[PDB]
């Protein structure tokens, strides 16, 4: 029943040793034994029905029984730019189908820009994302990118529609006129808001400002609600049976 991520391609493999986190989780946490089934996935959008052939201390060996395409991705591409707890945002954004997450520093965020410190957390956040995919069934694991400043993230250009929340905005997520090939780049800023220079940058970069209701939302809520709103309007959440 349990889904286990594997960090190396399983194409053409008939057996393998699970990763450290998986081996420890399978044999020590869950205390699973020889013969029991697992469902492995390697980030290629395929799943691999498997069985435990060895459940030891420090290692769990499995055999691979097959390889099947199992796409649980949205057709909308969402790239979340999220100003810096973020564990909940990462987990829920992955369940909700986000493809890429870039953690950001901003001028008024309240945290000192620290590249090294952020890099360690991101390692742990990548593991939160892996576990979210094991849980929710996604067979492609989103990337948690290196910490960036908000102004530099805003200047990246990869065909995506740039969005940010602002009370002056006309459009809502529902009334967005155009969703381009490259999907959406959603900026969620911190409680401190944007500096004057960052505002001018969003303007300079052609961001489309959006409303998200009459109530004041905490950061976590605003990101999950906007993601849900994108997915129901232009993604797989709104699709019928």
UniProtKB/Swiss-Prot annotation:
One Gene Ontology molecular-function label: rRNA (uridine-N3-)-methyltransferase activity
Enzyme Commission identifier(s): 2.1.1.193
Gene Ontology BP term (one): rRNA base methylation
Keywords from the UniProt entry: Cytoplasm, Methyltransferase, rRNA processing, S-adenosyl-L-methionine, Transferase
UniProt subcellular location: Cytoplasm
InterPro entries assigned to the protein according to its UniProt record, in alphabetical order: Alpha/beta_knot_MTases, PUA-like_sf, RsmE, RsmE_MTase_dom, RsmE_PUA-like, tRNA_m1G_MTases_N
Catalytic activity, reaction form: uridine(1498) in 16S rRNA + S-adenosyl-L-methionine = N(3)-methyluridine(1498) in 16S rRNA + S-adenosyl-L-homocysteine + H(+)
EC class name: transferase
Functional description taken from the UniProt entry: Specifically methylates the N3 position of the uracil ring of uridine 1498 (m3U1498) in 16S rRNA. Acts on the fully assembled 30S ribosomal subunit.
Homology family: Belongs to the RNA methyltransferase RsmE family.
Name of the protein in its database record: Ribosomal RNA small subunit methyltransferase E
Organism: Haemophilus influenzae (strain ATCC 51907 / DSM 11121 / KW20 / Rd)
Encoding gene (name): rsmE
């Amino acid at each position: 029943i349990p889904r286990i991520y594997h960090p190396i391609s399983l194409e053409n493999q008939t057996q393998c040793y699970l990763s450290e986190d998986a081996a420890n989780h399978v044999a020590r946490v869950l205390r699973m034994t020889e013969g029991e089934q697992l469902e492995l996935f390697d980030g290629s959008n395929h799943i691999y029905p498997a069985k435990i052939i060895e459940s030891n201390k420090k290692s769990v060996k499995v055999e691979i029984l097959g390889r099947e395409l199992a796409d649980k991705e949205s057709h909308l591409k969402i790239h979340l730019g999220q100003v810096i707890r973020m564990e909940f945002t990462i987990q829920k954004s992955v369940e909700l189908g986000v493809n890429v997450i870039t953690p950001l520093w901003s001028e008024r965020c309240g945290v000192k820009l620290d590249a090294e410190r952020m890099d360690k957390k991101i390692q742990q956040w990548q593991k939160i994302a892996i576990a979210a995919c094991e849980q929710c069934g996604r067979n492609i694991v989103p990337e948690i990118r290196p910490l960036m400043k908000l102004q530099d993230w805003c200047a990246e250009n990869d065909g995506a529609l740039k969005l940010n929340l602002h009370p002056r905005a006309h459009y809502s997520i529902k009334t967005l006129p155009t969703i381009p090939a490259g999907g959406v780049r959603l900026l969620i800023g911190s409680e401190g808001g944007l500096s004057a220079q960052e505002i001018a940058q969003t303007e300079q970069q052609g961001f489309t400002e959006i409303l998200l209701g009459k109530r004041v939302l905490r950061t976590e809520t605003a990101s999950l609600a906007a993601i849900s709103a994108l997915q129901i309007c232009f993604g797989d959440l709104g699709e019928e049976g």
